[PDB]
Amino acid sequence: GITFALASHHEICIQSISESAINHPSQLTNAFLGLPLEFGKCESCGATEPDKCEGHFGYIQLPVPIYHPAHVNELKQMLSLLCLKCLKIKEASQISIKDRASDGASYLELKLPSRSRLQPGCWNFLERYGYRYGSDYTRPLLAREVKEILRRIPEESRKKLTAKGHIPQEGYILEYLPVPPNCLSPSRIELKDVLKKVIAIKSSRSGETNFESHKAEASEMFRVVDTYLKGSGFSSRSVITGDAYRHVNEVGIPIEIAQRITFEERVSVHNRGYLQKLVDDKLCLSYTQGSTTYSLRDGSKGHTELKPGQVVHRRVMDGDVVFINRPPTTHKHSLQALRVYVHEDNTVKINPLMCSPLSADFDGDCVHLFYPQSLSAKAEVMELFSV
Amino acid sequence: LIAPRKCFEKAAEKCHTDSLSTVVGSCSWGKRVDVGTGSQFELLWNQKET
Amino acid sequence: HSIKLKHTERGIVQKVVLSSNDEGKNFAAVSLRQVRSPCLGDKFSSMHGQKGVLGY
Amino acid sequence: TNDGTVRNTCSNSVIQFKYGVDSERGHQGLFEAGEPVGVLAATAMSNPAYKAVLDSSPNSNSSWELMKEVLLCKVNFQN
Amino acid sequence: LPENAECMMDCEAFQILDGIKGQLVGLSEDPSIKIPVSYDRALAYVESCVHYTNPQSVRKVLEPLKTYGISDGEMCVIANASSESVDEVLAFIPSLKTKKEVINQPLQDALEELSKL
Amino acid sequence: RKTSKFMTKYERARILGTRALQISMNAPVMVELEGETDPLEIAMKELRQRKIPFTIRRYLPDGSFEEWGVDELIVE
Amino acid sequence: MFLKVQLPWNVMIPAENMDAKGLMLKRAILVELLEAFASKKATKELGYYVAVTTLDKIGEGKIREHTGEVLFPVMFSGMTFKIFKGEIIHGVVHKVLKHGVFMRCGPIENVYLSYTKMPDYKYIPGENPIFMNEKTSRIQVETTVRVVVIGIKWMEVEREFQALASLEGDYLGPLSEE
Amino acid sequence: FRNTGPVHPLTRQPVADRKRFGGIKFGEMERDCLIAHGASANLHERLFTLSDSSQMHICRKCKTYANGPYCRVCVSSDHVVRVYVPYGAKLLCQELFSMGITLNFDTKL
DNA sequence: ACAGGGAAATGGTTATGTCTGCTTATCGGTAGAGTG
RNA sequence: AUCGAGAGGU
DNA sequence: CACTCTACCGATAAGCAGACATACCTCTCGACCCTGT
Ligand SMILES: [Mg+2]
């Protein structure tokens, strides 16, 4: 069972195999992120085909603290649920918490009740843990204070948090921004804009975080919280007609469809001569040996020797089983296994006796006739889906 | 069924998931489906008669 | 880089017409003709609603 | 499951003790142990509704509506 | 290491590998199986480092040392050391400067056993 | 454990599939009925008898397992 | 030095050797264990595998899909080889160089012996690289030397253990037969 | 028709332009009918073999997705597991790691 | 005529029901404790 | 190659 | 032993925005703007 968790900055730093930070626009198309583009080279892995490219992540040095937008409720409840704890190592009963919606940003508010009187020396733990910025009712709570109060966790708090159903991680403050690989290539434009904003703000930093810096520590948060946050192989579809002069388990197939699609089967000892007399007359298309595939087109002057390790796919002939899929119908009876029949026309022959299990009239309906590939799938379709 | 972002973030903040064998994982992660031919029964080979 | 015919495209070239506009953009079109006779699977219809597929 | 009782994949919960009537009559039905029925009952309940509502039948409209009503009842409801 | 993990002594690999090389004739005579490359190397190593001939007598005479509070690691050390002098055991483990004055007697016992056998 | 002692169709399909896949991997047949064109017929004639080399191991929802040989089980 | 370890392994066995008599199946599975074990070199946590002596328990085999082969999970006990820090080991030297010698300690073939810690032996150039000291002692091929390991280093590309020896000391001499 | 050929550059699936080759998409009705019939082998076959197939790796000790394979904390890639995972789940975990949610793939083998 | 940043607005306001869910006023309903 | 829209057989 | 007076939990509506167009599959026909050197 897969388990979800939060991405802490240390985990992003460990996952990031590159040591250099991404600061320039041209660094997004470098070589250590795989080969999803049409032109370029790789330095990390070097898998030349796109089917082997998995992608490599990255990180951006971001020294500014940003709150997690969609996890403000989790922090709210985790801060409201804890009992009153004085000393975190190893008058505060009426404390309340609220939020302010300032330009879309969800900032936490530590507001005191109006019935209580304000005292400059109260909450000495907040004073020793951080400097009091706002001496009024509006106090901007910086994420550093939250990280500092949440860094040292006692045993009882750990037990109660593991019992309630949550767990705090070092990922609420985004310090290392994970950058997705180039497998995807407006998101790129927003990434470029936010990169320009963060580099401008970093160039506009001088000293510790004060009011003169907090006045410029706003647009970043607003830009963060404003806009920053299957097919199948085998297939066949054609018009179906009526044919009541054949068995119920027999269904027709055109020439080109039977010529294109094949049926995979492993080489056995009981059919040593049959496979040879089928492969010498050039009816098969290709054959796979180990991890490489060899075609059966014109150009081979050497005889195709039989080997149990070399798998072959035989063209569908009388003796193959297939199941069909109809327009959506509640009944599972619509899916059925029928033997294939060879003919010269291009349409499919369906007897009128199969109209009650299905729902397709001969008025122009379309079906989806599939092909089993594995021999286990062959047994499954011949035993379960059979009439 | 509904907007995937809210349920995904809820599962992320929950961080508690048990080992279950429903349709989830069998059709999205490649796990063997636990109904039909892939139900709870094994095929250990016996050496006594062979 | 040239346009290659896809699956259901085949025929005998019946007309090749080439032309340009005032903006200096050369155009060109090739028309391919196929003649067909009713074959199994082709839908027919009358003046009164009934509609069916040739089956034999 | 193999025990003959209807089991659930989550928390190993039991829904029914045996799938199949145990009256005086006896028939060897196609229902076996390792066979899913919840999906089968889902399709077999969605089929009749479809017909009743695809046709414009007003007699079947009342019948379909009652079935629709029983399929929308909720734990919390008001007036 | 598992619960049934014990360090092997000397000349047991000699005997076992001599048995394997005796079987090697029929093993190579059968074209179904190929000969490994590690057996002959290990047997050359054990013939270059063979010192004892009987495991049972040396085991029964060293068992009192196992009772004296000696584990099997240093047992293998003194077995593959052919230990007998005080300088040899000093150069083997330099951390015995404080306990040589009591460990000299097991060294004399080992010398006597090696001289007897 | 099981009083009915009836083989389900799903286990039958599984064992026929694995028997065909085994006989299709350069392995001789237990019965002397070689010469077929498809491995499905070989697997069917093999399961039609009682001599089957492998058996099935059922699982219990309580968290245990019970063995049941194919020799004592009967097939329809 | 040689440690007895019990470890589970999923051995692959085809079905062309399936017969009624069981001793043939036992010989087949044994020779398949041997041919599968004589293909790798060693491991990082366990060490050099030497051989297998006795089988403990036989386990029932499971079938694999898409390939038609049965896998036998068998519990067996085997012999391994591992060298530890500070464990003095006897080795024979084969190749001599300018900066050190290439001594052979059983299967390991990359035990490095640094020359900077060689106070008494001096290098003599010529066809045969040799080291001679005041005690009239030589270290060459077929000659065993007693060294003390000070460290071990692993290599993932060669699958070998790089051990560095030490020769500094007082009155160091070769072993004398009695 | 379709035996093999090009796929989608994003989802690694057969394209919708069925003029040449291509290939239809597996619908929910097909999966519903398959689970109703009680089939698991051919379902996984059509879901992995004929569809987008790939590979995945993680440390036995660590609980993160390892990109051959290398995890940085436990440098010893000697303890890795290779399990068959389709490309859809790979894109999903990639997108979740891009958003900021890590995945703990609990694997027995 | 092309590289680089991320903008460019025009006021306007009479024209799917029907619902689930989330967040605010409104109504009582207490429940004490100043008095008595 | 990509996106969106429109027109279709079920 | 009766009175009044405001702190606290409910029930309330009561207002507030959203949210939604079964599914398999076919074909053709156009797709960001203002400004500086
Ligand atoms: Mg119709």
Residue A117's Cβ-side half-sphere holds a number of Cα atoms within 13 Å equal to 2
Q: Is A378 exposed, middle or buried (0-12, 13-18, 19+ CB in 10 A)?
A: buried
Give the pairing of strands G108-114 and G160-164: parallel
Report the distance separating Cα G79 and Cα E12, nearest Å.
12
The amino acid sitting at H104 is N
Q: Which residues sit opposite A6 in a β-bridge?
A: H101
Report the distance separating Cα C18 and Cα C14, nearest Å.
14
Is the distance between the Cβ of D79 and the closest atom of strand I smaller than 7 Å? no
Report the distance separating Cα A311 and Cα A264, nearest Å.
8
Touching status, chains G and C (3+ beta-carbon pairs under 8 Å): no
Q: Comparing C-alpha atoms, which of E79, E90, E56 is closest to residue E7?
A: E79
Query: DSSP secondary-structure letter at A161?
Result: H
Report the distance separating Cα D4 and Cα B7, nearest Å.
35
Report the distance separating Cα E15 and Cα G95, nearest Å.
29
Nearest residue in G to E47, CA atom: G106
Q: How far from the centroid of its chain's Cα atoms is residue D12's Cα?
A: 20
Query: DSSP secondary-structure letter at C49?
Result: S
- Backbone φ and ψ for G55, nearest 5 degrees, come out as -85, 140
Report the distance separating Cα C1 and Cα G142, nearest Å.
71
Sign of the four-CA dihedral D36, D37, D42, D45: positive
Q: What is the residue extent of each domain of chain F?
A: 1-76
Report the distance separating Cα A266 and Cα G13, nearest Å.
18
Report the distance separating Cα A323 and Cα F69, nearest Å.
33
Residue A383's Cβ-side half-sphere holds a number of Cα atoms within 13 Å equal to 26
The three-state secondary structure class of F24 is coil
Residues A33, A147: contact at Cβ < 8 Å?
A: no
The residues placing their C-beta within 5 Å of ligand 1, an ion, are A 361, 363, 365
The three-state secondary structure class of A113 is coil
Q: Comparing C-alpha atoms, which of E49, E28, E29 is closest to residue E37?
A: E28
Angle at A283 between CA A278 and CA A286, to 5 degrees: 100
The three-state secondary structure class of A377 is helix
The three-state secondary structure class of G13 is strand
Report the distance separating Cα A359 and Cα E98, nearest Å.
95
The three-state secondary structure class of D55 is coil
Q: What is the 3-state secondary structure (H, E, C) of A165-220?
A: CCCCCCCCCCCECCECCHHHCCHHHHHHHHHHHHHHHHHCCCCCCCHHHHCCCCHH
Give the pairing of strands H80-83 and A310-315: unpaired
Residues F63, F28: contact at Cβ < 8 Å?
A: no
Q: Which residues sit opposite A58 in a β-bridge?
A: A179
- CA H18 to C1' K26, whole Å: 9
The two structure tokens encoding residue G64: 């694999």
CA D26 to each of CA A234, D22, D29, E6: distance values in angstroms, whole numbers, following the listed order:
44, 7, 9, 65
Instruction: Note whether D1 contacts B40, CB cutoff 8 Å.
Output: yes
Residues D33, F8: contact at Cβ < 8 Å?
A: yes
Residues A221, A105: contact at Cβ < 8 Å?
A: yes
Is the distance between the Cβ of A196 and the closest atom of strand I smaller than 7 Å? yes
CA A375 to each of CA A239, A264, A371, A382, H4: distance values in angstroms, whole numbers, following the listed order:
28, 8, 11, 10, 19
Report the distance separating Cα F17 and Cα F11, nearest Å.
10
Report the distance separating Cα E85 and Cα E108, nearest Å.
8
- Judged by a CB distance cut-off of 8 A, whether residue B20 touches chain D is yes
Report H helices in chain A.
Answer: 9-15, 72-81, 124-129, 143-151, 155-164, 187-203, 211-214, 219-226, 255-260, 272-279, 375-383
Report H helices in D1-79.
Answer: 38-54, 58-70
Residues G20, G41: contact at Cβ < 8 Å?
A: no
Residues of chain G contacting A376 with CB distance shorter than 8 Å: 65-66
The amino acid sitting at G49 is Y
Asked how this structure was determined, the answer is cryo-EM
Please, what is the end-to-end C-alpha distance for chain B in angstroms? 52
The amino acid sitting at H3 is N
- Backbone φ and ψ for G5, nearest 5 degrees, come out as -125, 140
**Contacts with A380 (C-beta within 8 Å, 6 or more apart), sequence order:** A372, B37, F13, F17, H39, H41, H42
What is the enclosing helix (H) or strand (E) of H14? Answer: none
Report the distance separating Cα G33 and Cα G53, nearest Å.
12
- CA F15 to C1' K21, whole Å: 47
Touching status, chains E and C (3+ beta-carbon pairs under 8 Å): no
Report the distance separating Cα F43 and Cα F53, nearest Å.
12
Please, what is the end-to-end C-alpha distance for chain D in angstroms? 42
**Contacts with B41 (C-beta within 8 Å, 6 or more apart), sequence order:** D2, D34, F11, F56, F57, F58, F59
Instruction: Note whether G6 contacts E4, CB cutoff 8 Å.
Output: yes
Interface size between B and D, measured as CB pairs under 8 A: 16
Query: DSSP secondary-structure letter at B32?
Result: P
Residues A310, A288: contact at Cβ < 8 Å?
A: yes
Please, what is the end-to-end C-alpha distance for chain G in angstroms? 25
Residues of chain G contacting H77 with CB distance shorter than 8 Å: 156
To the question of whether residue H93 is assigned a binding role by annotation, the answer is: no
Q: What is the DSSP string of A251-303?
A: EEE-HHHHHH-EEEE---STTHHHHHHHHTTT---EEEETTEEEE-STT--S-
The two structure tokens encoding residue A94: 């009426």
The amino acid sitting at A326 is R
Give the pairing of strands A105-109 and A98-102: antiparallel
Residues D14, D5: contact at Cβ < 8 Å?
A: yes
Q: How far from the centroid of its chain's Cα atoms is residue C37's Cα?
A: 14
Residues A308, A319: contact at Cβ < 8 Å?
A: no
Report the distance separating Cα D70 and Cα D73, nearest Å.
6
Using CB atoms and an 8 Å cut-off, which of residues 3-62 of chain H contact chain C?
19-21
Q: How far is G7 from chain F (nearest CA, A)?
A: 25
Give the pairing of strands B41-42 and G130-132: unpaired
- Judged by a CB distance cut-off of 8 A, whether residue B44 touches chain F is yes
Q: How far from the centroid of its chain's Cα atoms is residue G29's Cα?
A: 25
- Judged by a CB distance cut-off of 8 A, whether residue A259 touches chain C is no
Instruction: Note whether G44 contacts H76, CB cutoff 8 Å.
Output: yes
Report the distance separating Cα A362 and Cα C54, nearest Å.
9
Residues with CB under 7 A from strand K: A 189, 237, 327-328, 366; B 2-3; H 16-19, 22, 24-25, 27-29
Report the distance separating Cα G64 and Cα G159, nearest Å.
30
Resolution for this experimental structure (Å): 4.3
- Backbone φ and ψ for C52, nearest 5 degrees, come out as -145, 170
